[PDB]
């Protein structure tokens, strides 16, 4: 399990996401599974569903263990529920090990799997904190680590219905994934990946907020989310910003929503009318940030429907969100992104599989410095529910 032999281990479709394979099981029943930095549980398809043709079979897997204790994990708009068990993991281009790992064995869902992608299961890679049931559930990453002597980081590349690839290199970082620099921003608390943005700029303009309204009321890196969603306030500032660059172009606000797609006749989008959007992070050094830059390229996504499949089509993949911002497929695709969870870090770096224009490119830059830098991040207002809860650990 090289670096080479983890490279361009991931697939997906188009808005749908990304993939590894993993064998869960004695003997090896082979899954493809959504590599997920939102979410802590590692779960699996294991009824059938009409959107699945496999899916895990407890009962063909002579090394799993029932933990007799069930899970309900509820999203805003769909559910999973299932069993919780363990059994013996393997990821077969990644490293050459095998761990006994948790695994809820899926029983009903909603609006979870989908039509056309070909996953069958979740990798949530993020950590113990926001694991269900509750935190005391180990994910599969702090067993990985625990279990082997597998370095405690990962990294992804994502390169951007169309077919996708890219690469998680699981335990260490491969150079030839990334072009320049490799920028780290602080993991301000390990739940989510959560980041700290200082500073956004649309075509070199600040958008000028509270740096606080930038992570309202947090701030993430989420492979298991398509767009850049950004706070409300936040993504009204940024879409009058758009709106005012491309104004050559009328769109209807469906567009602007992400409910409708805008076409040109193909090989003639006018991709200079839209600008570049720079989030600055804070930097390791106290005053300093660095800033990823993206393209149009990575916030406008291209969508093929017929008859008029002359035209090239896109849908606005910055979206509005009431959750904080979550730095998803349109940010990630621009970078190599490293999960360094040793160092308490979140590395970016440019890509080598860059979706990009003639004049144009996605960047990673700093020192930039601040005097009088403010505190960005925002305190969640604590609940009773919360405050209550022990945590012997
Ligand atoms: C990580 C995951 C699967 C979690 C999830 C659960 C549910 Cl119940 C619905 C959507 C999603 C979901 N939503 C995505 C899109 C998506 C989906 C999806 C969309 N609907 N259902 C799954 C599968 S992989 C990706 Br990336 C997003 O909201 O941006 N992501
Ligand atoms: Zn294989
Ligand atoms: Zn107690
Ligand atoms: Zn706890």
Same mark, same amino acid.
């Given at each position: ?67 007799? !204790?069930?899970?309900?994990?509820? #999203?805003?708009?769909? /559910?999973?529920?299932?069993?919780? %068990? @363990?059994?013996?993991?393997?990821? *077969? ?114 958008? !000028?907020?509270?740096?606080?309204? #930038?992570?309202?009321? /947090?701030?993430?890196?989420?492979? %298991? @989310?398509?767009?850049?969603?950004? *706070? ?162």
């Amino acid at each position: 399990g090289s670096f080479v032999e983890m490279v361009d281990n991931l697939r997906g479709k188009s808005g749908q996401g990304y993939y590894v394979e993993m064998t869960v099981g004695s003997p090896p029943q082979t899954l493809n599974i959504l590599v997920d930095t939102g979410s802590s549980n590692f779960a699996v398809g294991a009824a059938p569903h009409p959107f699945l043709h496999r899916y895990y079979q407890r009962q063909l897997s002579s090394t799993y263990r029932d933990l007799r !204790k069930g899970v309900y994990v509820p #999203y805003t708009q769909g /559910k999973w529920e299932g069993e919780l %068990g @363990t059994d013996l993991v393997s990821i *077969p281009h990644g490293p050459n090990v095998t761990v006994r790992a948790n695994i809820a064995a899926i029983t009903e869902s909603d609006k979870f799997f989908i039509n056309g992608s070909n996953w069958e299961g979740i990798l949530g890679l993020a950590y113990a904190e926001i694991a269900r049931p509750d935190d005391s559930l180990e994910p599969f990453f702090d067993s990985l680590v625990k279990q082997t002597h597998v370095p405690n980081l990962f990294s992804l590349q994502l390169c951007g219905l169309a077919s996708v690839g890219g690469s998680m290199i699981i335990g260490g970082i491969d150079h030839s994934l990334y072009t320049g620099s490799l920028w780290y921003t602080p993991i301000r608390r390990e739940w989510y990946y959560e980041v700290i943005i200082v500073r956004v700029e649309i075509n070199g303009q600040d958008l !000028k907020m509270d740096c606080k309204e #930038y992570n309202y009321d /947090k701030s993430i890196v989420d492979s %298991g @989310t398509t767009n850049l969603r950004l *706070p409300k306030k936040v993504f009204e500032a940024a879409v009058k910003s758009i709106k005012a660059a491309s104004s050559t172009e009328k769109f209807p606000d469906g567009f602007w929503l992400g409910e409708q797609l805008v076409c040109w006749q193909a090989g003639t989008t006018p991709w200079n009318i839209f600008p570049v959007i720079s989030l600055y992070l804070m930097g390791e050094v106290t005053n300093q940030s660095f800033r990823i830059t993206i393209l149009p390229q990575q916030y406008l996504r291209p969508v093929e429907d017929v008859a008029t499949s002359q035209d090239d089509c896109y849908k606005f993949a910055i979206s509005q969100s009431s959750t904080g911002t979550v730095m998803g497929a349109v940010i990630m695709e621009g970078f190599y992104v490293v999960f360094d969870r040793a160092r308490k870090r979140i590395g970016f770096a440019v890509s080598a599989c860059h979706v990009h224009d003639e004049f144009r490119t996605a960047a990673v830059e700093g020192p930039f410095v601040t005097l009088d830098m403010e505190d960005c991040g925002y305190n969640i207002p604590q609940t009773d529910e919360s405050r209550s809860h022990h945590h012997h650990h």
